[PDB]
Design a protein around this ligand. Structure first.
Ligand SMILES: CCC/C(C)=C/C=C(\C)C(=O)[C@H]1C(=O)C=C([C@H](C)CCC/C=N/C(=O)OC)OC1=O
Ligand SMILES: [Mg+2]
Ligand SMILES: [Zn+2]
Ligand SMILES: [Zn+2]
Lengths: 1119, 57, 56, 170, 95, 112, 226, 150
């Protein structure tokens, strides 16, 4: 068909690289590829220039030089795809040119040390951790600078504070019950700030007198002038402020440290809070943070501005510099690069600790290179990091958007100093500054709400870890294509008109305009304007944008949509919406789902397994096509060629459609005939009915890939093995698993079959004497070997598809200790649609398949065409999620109009326009009718009569005509496939793009009866092929109690759970078809008693006669 | 009252603070044993010392 | 017209006036018809139904 | 954790009658295995126990009559459905199940009230009242069809909710 | 549903009382085959399996029915702890 | 065979304590590693807590349930369900008296 | 017969607020601080919102999905207490004999400074339904045996009776005045409420009450709002 | 609740209320101290030993007490429940010294124990109800004339 785009906002510039964040943050943190170790250390190399120069020089031993020179790395031991296979971690060792000298000018330079290797970032932006696709979430924090927070407790004034960001850096705060106390709080210990004022080299005079001027209230300062006359005195004294007790020898112990050492600096050389402080405190500072060199003493252009500012603040109107924390202009975002580097430092610093412990017993010169070395500490750090990092989580590649959007998220969780689970209500809040930076709407539904968010599509973060948003410069009515990314603060400085502002060429088209001044909803004649929003899109997260008519549904339900799209699964019969916002196309590119042409040429070869092409110049590049492959979440991930031989094609041209890409457009589902209306309560509550037809069309049919594993352990009781030869009884149970241990690929397996055959030795390989006899009676070969083969877990299986075997694989296998070899089998299954699956439209409208109807009874139109799905209308009012409605309305036209549409967000379609298209369509739908010698269905009349009584149609009009009128209201006439009789009332029908949602194995259909039992608690435990029990809790106890079902609750917790002997006796009883024994004491309790006793506490069960009672019936009574 | 003091320290049944083998040559337990251990250690050491008419210090 | 309450009240009485079990029958009865009708009721939702009064 | 428990997603059963509830045979099966087993044995089809036992270990080798018996057992018996959070006793109710296809639980529309839960994904927990005695309390003071009024207000809890009303109202 | 349920209540002082009752009848009514009942074949819990009607085995069903027919008696304290089983094990050997 | 109706909670007579202990732990030794053996007089000395194999002594001189509950004249371990191992309690004899904290840090510090 | 109308009305689904938004004015949305905005959200959902419009709204959207989380996640918190507090209480006796009781009003004083005012049925009903009459009651030419349970109608009647300025208080056996040992006698409780009849002995009332209270909790405005 | 359109019968609440009044404080000993704030009913034996029961004529003056649910229950006669809640140690410790006996009047306790519930079917009142057929009402006769040996 033909695509018809809408709205007319001139997006001056297309969207930015997406994963871009992850990619560059990292790119700008390594300096590998093109970086010649020339002019920069910004990240890791800075991580270097700090862990260096590490010295241990006593001018006596003289020179003990050990500095950095050049960092290096570059041989990924193995290839990505290969790393995944053997549960490896794609990365590359890291060498380093260093230098150790000697007082004797002994400059021996062992320019090598590759002990540690570090992970690498995929072409898409993710990581491979132990074969697992892992992802790193960029989290936010309170940018390092100076702030003045209104003192909470006392509603009289407020507290100021400072924040450099090292793992062991300063954290200043000020306050005062001033009479004298210049309350200067440090770690947990405060005192008068004055004392410090002189250590600076300034007394009450140079300070309090010249400054305490406008700050006439500087009495909260000047109290000890004598302490303020010879820097040196106050100087020493202050140490007091520290424990335990040391002599005034270290004239500058903790000083030089809080001067030009990593501590004081927020960022390197000011960048962090300099702009902050400085721009909010007059001018620049002393070098980078607080430093003073070639003078000895220490000059502080720090507290200098600070204090006086708290004054300029604890004053009248000298700047009124309050501090809205949530203000984005005051919150930084740590990104992978940065985020990782710090972790790089810890284990790094953890190595220097190591290296310094070496100068001790280090020979004269039997120490030079790496005899002073050890990666493990640092190795662990980072390793430990990724692998076990809170922000390190399995790549969510449910589909692409899923995987992509996942990258775009922002955490507020993590650093035990930068993150806290103390629900910060107002922090979870959507602060004004979020506009065009954070998806106001996109956020995980659940207690993690407002803590995890997505990035506003257009929003971008600069190396300073700050976001910025697109804005075009305005000139008294004239609109410039000159864009301007900008931050939160800078933003408040201006007046921003909404993008959608009427225009002409560039001249604005309005006497009054819609804008916001630093979040100020205002109207203004043009001249007054300064900047305009580039495009609505810039506000919301990406997937959020994928929603059509967003401007029509309530944000809340909207939230649902976004989330859901991420949970959308790749159908075989992929389909992009009959209507799109506009991103779909751009997405696939960035997601890296499909393949495009990096130049023009002819289609060389294109077999299903691969494609090759010749370039203009004449280059033959065969493109290995990743075939059917598992998703982290097991979904299928495959690309499909759409181009053919001899076919010429230019750059940017697609070649193979990713998993969920159609024509190169996102196809998170399928478009279909939905008819909104109640159907015998089968769509009762969110419940959704389905035209059996769809299945026949294998529409909603997916392919899940499931992987299983097994281990060869060299047991102490003797190693176990993978053999087709097992103590098993039958043979028909070996039909397929005949391949000398393994099951032959491509086999229809069902819960209970043997993917793999394994055997070991039980009961410490001691055959029961009981069993003994039995066994002998039929050939007593007590094979000490127990069959412990791998079976298909219950529920369901599918058919084999692939098998991988690792035998301490000399090629690179690193089998876990105790493991001889391992095995992996992958089973696929075309999970098709069935009663239960859940579906959702981009409009938060979600629900489950309640019933599948026979196309017959299925509601159809006069032209005997049945819709495919029936949607109850109730789920809308209480949802105010109209959007979908329109989507269907238009979904209906293009249906006949054999086309698709692109309606922009807060733009695109408009009732008229739609109301229009229908009319056209009405021709197709209706028009033909007569050209077939066909008039109006008698029943059609029936309805219409009724139709106008509802003021739907304008009375007296031609029956035929009336229809149109109706049609335009998106409603049509429907016949009941069952009764045939029409439906008393028009029915709005039409197309809707729907998605099938992912099925969590946790959401699987469980059902236990009896099985494993926690070795301790002695309570139902679930195995691999055995289910677990339901967590029966107090809430349920309470409920039960309320009713009064004594027994149940008892047996419930006893027999059914903790009472040992019971259950068995129970089982048996049932078996023999007998009644049930009574409940004894639950281990839980017995156990309890013991615990008590163990705590030296007699617990005594007694009767009426107050006579003790043994709950252990014997095994407690001794002697 | 005397009861509140101790000289007879109880001990949980084994299977309630078990010791089990787990992975390729390793096992697991409850801290108790440990706690328990150290304790015993101390007491028995003590015995000797007294048995050693040692400096009451 | 029948609705929530009307019904509710009706129910309560039912439950009272006549035993509880027969009442159940009723419910289902209701259930049944309530459903059957709604389906045929020809009651959809078109953006047009978002009838915007002029007094706006 | 309970022994004869199970969980699955719920669906609405317009066919169901107040005191009934749809139950995936497959799932049902496990929950009653023993009882079932017995019946089997009790019928030629199954010589002894371990027989039936293994006889069912694999779905492929799961015969027909199997179900025909399973039902038999069930006759009269009821079970319990839970949809957490269980806030008020009616957060649990009993029903005589009816065997159903598909791996999903068919819940009766009226109870969705107390079981404040819709079919936008809600799953439910099932439990089997073992002893004759348990079954009793159950089938008596816990049958969905026996709690129509609200213990708090005393008002008809189980009553026309959405679709139904509308129809009627119409 | 559940027949006579209401009426069933109308035959006890306490809701729960009834339960207990039934239950016990079941038990015993089980422990002794079924010859124990207080009703003829004409009226008997049935089932339609294998094309036909064959006695229903769900004790409650039975218990419940009997009660309806005043052909049975409960009470707080009716008789001696063992005479029942006793006399009862004679009349209907069950086993 | 009957039922209860009252639960008690009283301190523990060192006597009572000793009235429970199916023996006294004297040795720290957990389990022998070479064979994973409940160290003698140690924390798992099943001589104290019982068979690890229901109805069966250590040295194995006794096995079948046909030795109801006859102690081993050798390994000195009884014969019964190993299950009792999660129920029987042993003790330690304190060279010196030690205070039970729950009567100190709990205020009023009962004793004080 | 318009759908919506039909719906909301029948109560089948949707209330006014919901509609007002859809059909006409979404109205005022308020700030995070909590202070309502000065400019309103003119657009109806049908009309479609402004980027600006849309945005501004959301704040409450958060607090909305926010607020809820706290109870939806869990609020049993309440019940829990109650439970711990009322579990033991059970229907134990038949008659505890308490000569005393309580008298339920039908009027409220200080709505205006002490003027009198009849209570809303609901309230009243909530207070006397299935209650057991303390003393006999002569009214509207009809007397009420003292010890008589309060059917639904009965109440109405009374209700009707007080309208004829014929009464104000009501002698009724209550738990407060029940004399049972950590439980309650069949009389000081009354109807069952799951069934409209006199509660049978051995009923788990303590627990019941606790739940009846807890459950609702999850749907009460958490933080003070105005 | 009403203000939130929640229809709830008074009872339920009233119930929870009685419990806050459940305990009371003392002013006139007889044989106990003053801090003692106890479960109100103990008075028909204790406070009825007035000039009649024990006839000792030793009065017992006390004070009405109002405490929060937390409190009230937490101070239960049954030590278990009391321990089942926060500050388990204290509870115990006390009950230990007092060597408290916990009856099983309440549920939680009886439950957590492993015993059949005190109410519902667990309510003694009915628990025992007996039932046998009329066919057995002829059975009594056996042991009823199992004495008429000619
Ligand atoms: C002094 C501490 C006592 C204590 C709580 C012991 C718990 C032990 C031994 C367990 O393991 C238990 C446990 O975890 C949980 C339970 C059930 C599921 C919940 C019972 C709660 C009932 N609640 C009410 O009926 O409320 C009015 O029971 C246990 O014995
Ligand atoms: Mg739900
Ligand atoms: Zn031995
Ligand atoms: Zn009473």
């Amino acid at each position: 068909m033909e695509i018809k785009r809408f709205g007319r906002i001139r997006e001056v510039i297309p969207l930015p690289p997406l994963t871009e964040i992850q990619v560059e943050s990292y790119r700008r943190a390594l300096q590998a590829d093109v970086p010649p170790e020339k002019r920069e250390n910004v990240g890791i190399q800075a991580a270097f220039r700090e862990t260096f120069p590490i010295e241990e020089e006593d001018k006596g031993k003289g020179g003990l030089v050990l500095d950095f020179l050049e960092y290096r790395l570059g041989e990924p031991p193995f290839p990505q795809d290969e790393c995944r296979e053997k549960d490896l971690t794609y990365q590359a060792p890291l060498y380093a040119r260093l230098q150790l000298i000697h007082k004797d000018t002994g400059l021996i330079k062992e320019d090598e040390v590759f002990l540690g290797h570090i992970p690498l970032m995929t072409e898409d932006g993710s990581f491979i951790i132990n074969g697992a696709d892992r992802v790193i979430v960029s989290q936010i924090h309170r940018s390092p600078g100076v702030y003045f927070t209104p003192d909470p407790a006392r509603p009289g004034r407020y507290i100021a504070s400072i924040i450099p960001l090292p793992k062991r850096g300063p954290w200043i705060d000020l306050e005062v019950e001033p009479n004298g106390v210049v309350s200067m709080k440090v770690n947990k210990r405060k005192f008068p700030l004055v004392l410090l004022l002189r250590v600076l080299g300034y007394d009450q005079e140079t300070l309090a007198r010249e400054l305490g001027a406008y700050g006439e209230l500087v009495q909260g300062l000047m109290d000890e002038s004598v302490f303020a006359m010879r820097p040196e005195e106050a100087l020493i004294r202050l140490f007091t402020l520290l424990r335990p007790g040391d002599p005034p020898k270290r004239d500058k112990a903790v000083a030089y440290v809080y001067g030009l050492i990593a501590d004081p600096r927020r960022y390197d050389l000011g960048e962090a809070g300099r702009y902050k402080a400085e721009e909010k405190l007059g001018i620049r500072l002393s070098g980078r943070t607080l430093a003073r060199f070639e003078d000895g003493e220490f000059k502080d252009e720090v507290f200098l501005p600070t204090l006086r500012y708290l004054f300029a603040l604890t004053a009248g109107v000298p700047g009124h510099e309050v501090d809205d924390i949530d203000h984005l202009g005051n919150r930084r975002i740590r990104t992978v690069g940065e985020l990782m580097t710090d972790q790089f430092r810890v284990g790094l610093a953890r190595l220097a600790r190591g290296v310094r412990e070496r100068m001790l017993m280090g020979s004269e010169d039997s120490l030079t290179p790496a005899k002073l070395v050890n990666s493990r500490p640092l190795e662990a750090a980072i390793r430990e990091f990724f692998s076990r990092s809170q922000l390190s989580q399995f790549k969510d590649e449910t589909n692409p958007l899923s995987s992509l959007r996942h990258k775009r998220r922002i955490s507020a969780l993590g650093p035990g100093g930068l993150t806290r689970e103390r629900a910060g209500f107002d922090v979870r809040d959507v602060h004004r500054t979020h506009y065009g930076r954070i998806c106001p709407v996109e956020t995980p539904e659940g207690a993690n709400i407002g803590l995890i968010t997505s990035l506003a599509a257009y929003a971008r973060v600069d190396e300073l870890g700050f976001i910025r948003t697109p804005y075009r410069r305005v000139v008294g009515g004239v609109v410039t294509d000159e864009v301007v990314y900008m931050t939160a603060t800078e933003e408040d400085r201006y007046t921003i008109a909404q993008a959608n502002t009427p225009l002409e060429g560039n001249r604005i088209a309005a006497e009054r305009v819609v804008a916001r001044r630093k979040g100020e909803p205002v109207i203004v004649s043009p001249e007054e304007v300064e900047f305009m929003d580039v495009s609505p899109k810039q506000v919301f997260s990406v997937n959020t944008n994928l929603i059509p008519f967003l401007e029509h549904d309530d944000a809340n339900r909207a939230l649902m949509g976004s989330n859901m799209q991420t949970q959308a699964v790749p159908l075989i019969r992929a389909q992009a919406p009959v209507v799109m916002t506009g991103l779909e196309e751009r997405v696939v590119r960035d997601s890296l789902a499909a393949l495009y042409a990096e130049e023009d040429g002819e289609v060389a070869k294109v077999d299903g397994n691969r494609i090759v092409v010749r370039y203009e110049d004449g280059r033959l590049v065969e493109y290995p096509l990743r075939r059917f492959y598992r998703s982290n979440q097991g979904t299928a991930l495959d690309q499909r060629p759409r181009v053919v031989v001899g076919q010429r094609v230019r750059k940017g041209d697609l070649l193979a459609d990713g998993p969920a890409s159609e024509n190169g457009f996102l196809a998170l589902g399928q478009n279909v005939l939905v008819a909104i209306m109640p159907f015998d309560g089968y769509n009762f509550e969110d419940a959704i009915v389905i035209s059996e037809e769809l299945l026949k069309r294998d529409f909603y049919t997916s392919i899940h890939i499931e992987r299983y594993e097994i281990e060869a352990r060299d047991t102490k009781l003797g190693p176990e093995r993978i053999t087709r030869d097992i103590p098993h009884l039958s043979e028909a149970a070996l039909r397929d698993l005949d391949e000398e241990g393994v099951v032959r690929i491509g086999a229809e397996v069902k819960p209970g079959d043997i993917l793999v055959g394994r055997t070991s030795f039980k009961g410490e390989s001691e055959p029961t004497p009981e069993e003994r006899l039995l066994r002998s009676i039929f050939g007593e070969k007590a094979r000490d070997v127990k069959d412990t083969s791998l079976r298909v877990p219950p529920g369901e299986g599918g058919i084999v598809v692939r098998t991988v075997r690792l035998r301490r694989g000399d090629p690179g296998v690193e089998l876990k200790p105790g493991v001889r070899e391992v095995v992996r089998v992958y089973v696929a299954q075309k999970r098709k649609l069935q009663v239960g699956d859940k579906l959702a439209n981009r409009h938060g409208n979600k629900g489950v398949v309640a019933k599948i109807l026979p196309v017959e009874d299925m509601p159809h139109l006069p032209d005997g065409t049945p819709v495919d799905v029936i949607l109850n209308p109730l789920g809308v009012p209480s949802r105010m999620n109209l959007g979908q409605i329109l989507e269907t309305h238009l979904g209906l036209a293009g249906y006949f109009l054999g086309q698709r549409y692109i309606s922009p967000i807060f733009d695109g379609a408009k009732e008229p326009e739609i109301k229009e298209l229908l009319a056209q369509a009405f021709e197709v739908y209706f028009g033909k009718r007569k050209g077939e010698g066909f008039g109006v269905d008698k029943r059609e009349v029936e309805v219409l009569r009724r139709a106008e009584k509802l003021g739907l149609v304008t009375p007296g009009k031609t029956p035929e005509e009336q229809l149109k009128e109706l049609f335009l209201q998106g409603k049509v006439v429907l016949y009941d496939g069952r009764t045939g009789e029409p439906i008393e009332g028009p029915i709005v029908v039409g197309q809707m793009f729907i998605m099938k949602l992912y099925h969590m194995v946790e959401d699987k259909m469980h059902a236990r009866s009896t099985g494993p039992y926690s070795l301790i608690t002695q309570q139902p435990l679930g195995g691999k092929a055995q289910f677990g029990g339901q967590r029966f809790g107090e809430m349920e106890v309470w409920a039960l109690e309320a009713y009064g079902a004594a027994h149940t609750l008892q047996e419930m917790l006893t027999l059914k759970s903790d009472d040992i002997e019971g259950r068995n006796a129970a089982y048996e009883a049932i078996i023999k078809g007998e009644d049930v024994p009574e409940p004894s004491v639950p281990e839980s309790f017995r156990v309890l008693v013991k615990e008590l006793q163990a705590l030296a506490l007699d617990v005594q069960t007694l009767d009426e006669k107050d006579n003790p009672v043994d709950i252990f019936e014997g095994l407690a009574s001794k002697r | 009252p005397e009861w509140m003091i101790l000289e007879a320290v109880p001990v949980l049944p084994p299977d309630l603070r078990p010791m089990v083998q787990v992975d390729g040559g390793r096992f697991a337990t409850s801290d108790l044993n440990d706690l328990y251990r150290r304790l015993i250690n101390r007491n028995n050491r003590l015995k000797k010392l007294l048995a050693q008419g040692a400096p009451e210090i | 017209p029948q609705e929530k309450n009307s019904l509710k009240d009706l129910v309560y009485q039912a439950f009272l006036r006549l035993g509880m079990e027969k009442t159940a029958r009723l419910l289902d009865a209701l259930k049944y018809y309530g459903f059957t009708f709604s389906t045929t009721s020809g009651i959809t939702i078109g953006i047009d139904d978002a009838v915007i009064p002029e007094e706006k | 954790r309970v022994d004869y428990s199970g969980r699955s997603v719920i669906v609405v059963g317009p066919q169901l009658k107040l005191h009934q509830c749809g139950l995936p045979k497959r799932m049902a099966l496990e929950l009653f295995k023993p009882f079932l087993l017995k019946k089997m044995e009790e019928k030629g089809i199954a010589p002894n126990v371990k027989a039936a036992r293994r006889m069912l270990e694999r779905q492929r080798d799961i015969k027909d009559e199997v179900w025909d018996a399973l039902e038999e057992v069930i006759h009269g018996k009821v079970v319990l459905l839970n949809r957490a959070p269980t806030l008020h006793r009616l957060g649990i109710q009993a029903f005589q199940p009816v065997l159903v296809e598909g791996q999903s639980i068919q819940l009766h529309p009226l109870v969705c009230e107390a079981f404040n839960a819709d079919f936008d994904g809600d799953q439910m927990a099932v439990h089997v009242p073992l002893s004759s005695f348990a079954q009793a309390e159950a089938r008596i003071q816990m049958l969905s069809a026996h709690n129509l009024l609200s213990p708090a207000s005393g008002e008809p809890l189980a009553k026309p909710s959405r679709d139904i009303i509308l129809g009627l109202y119409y | 549903a559940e027949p006579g349920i209401d009426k069933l209540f109308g035959m006890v002082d306490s809701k729960y009382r009834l339960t207990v009752v039934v239950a016990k009848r079941a038990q015993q009514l089980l422990r002794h085959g079924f010859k124990n009942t207080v009703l003829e074949p004409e009226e008997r819990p049935k089932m339609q399996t294998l094309e036909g009607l064959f006695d229903d085995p769900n004790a409650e069903t039975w218990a419940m029915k009997e009660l309806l027919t005043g052909r049975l008696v409960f009470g707080e304290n009716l008789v001696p702890e063992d005479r029942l089983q006793k006399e009862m094990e004679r009349i209907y050997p069950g086993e | 065979k009957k039922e209860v109706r009252k639960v008690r909670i009283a301190l523990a007579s060192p006597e009572k304590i000793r009235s429970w202990s199916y023996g006294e732990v004297e040795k720290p030794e957990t389990i022998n590693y070479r064979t994973l053996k409940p160290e003698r007089d140690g924390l798992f000395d099943e001589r104290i807590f019982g068979p690890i194999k229901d109805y069966e002594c250590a040295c194995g001189k006794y096995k079948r349930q046909r030795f109801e509950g006859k102690v081993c004249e050798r390994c000195g371990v009884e014969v019964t369900k190993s299950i009792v191992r999660r129920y029987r309690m042993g003790h330690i004899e304190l060279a010196t008296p030690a205070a039970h904290i729950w009567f100190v840090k709990d205020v009023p510090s009962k004793i004080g | 017969f318009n759908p919506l109308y039909v719906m909301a009305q029948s109560g089948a689904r949707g209330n006014p607020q919901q509609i007002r938004q859809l059909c006409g004015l979404r109205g005022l949305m308020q700030k995070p601080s909590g202070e309502t905005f000065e400019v309103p959200v003119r657009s109806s959902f049908r009309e479609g919102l402004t980027v600006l419009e849309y945005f501004i709204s959301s704040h409450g959207a958060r607090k909305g999905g926010a607020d809820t989380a706290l109870r939806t996640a869990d609020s049993g918190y309440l019940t829990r207490k109650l439970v711990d507090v009322t579990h033991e209480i059970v229907v134990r006796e038949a008659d505890c004999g308490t000569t005393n009781y309580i008298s339920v009003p039908l009027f409220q004083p200080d709505e205006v400074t002490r003027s009198l005012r009849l209570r809303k049925r609901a309230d009243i009903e909530a207070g006397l339904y299935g209650r057991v009459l303390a003393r006999e009651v002569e009214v509207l030419g009809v007397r009420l045996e003292e010890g008589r349970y309060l059917s639904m109608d009965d109440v109405h009647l009374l209700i009707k009776a007080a309208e004829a300025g014929e009464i104000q208080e009501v002698p009724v056996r209550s738990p407060l005045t029940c004399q049972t040992r950590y439980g309650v006698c069949q009389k000081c409780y009354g109807y069952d409420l799951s069934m409209a009849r006199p509660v049978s002995i051995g009923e788990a009332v303590g627990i019941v009450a606790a739940q009846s209270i807890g459950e609702p909790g999850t749907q009460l405005t958490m933080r003070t709002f105005h | 609740y009403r203000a939130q359109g929640v229809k709830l019968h008074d009872k339920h609440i009233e119930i929870v209320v009685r419990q806050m009044m459940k305990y009371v404080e003392v002013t006139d000993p007889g044989d106990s101290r003053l801090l003692e704030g106890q479960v109100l009913e103990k008075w028909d034996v204790e406070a009825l030993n007035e000039r009649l029961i024990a006839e000792g004529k030793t009065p017992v003056a006390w004070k009405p007490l109002l405490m929060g649910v937390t409190k009230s229950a937490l101070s239960t006669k049954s030590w278990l429940s009391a321990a089942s809640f926060q500050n388990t140690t204290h509870v115990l410790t006390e009950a230990a010294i007092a060597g408290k006996k916990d009856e099983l009047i309440g549920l939680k306790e009886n439950v957590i124990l492993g015993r059949l519930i005190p109410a519902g079917t667990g309510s003694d009142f009915v628990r025992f109800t007996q039932v046998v057929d009329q066919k057995t009402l002829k059975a009594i006769e056996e042991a009823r004339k199992e004495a008429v040996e000619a």
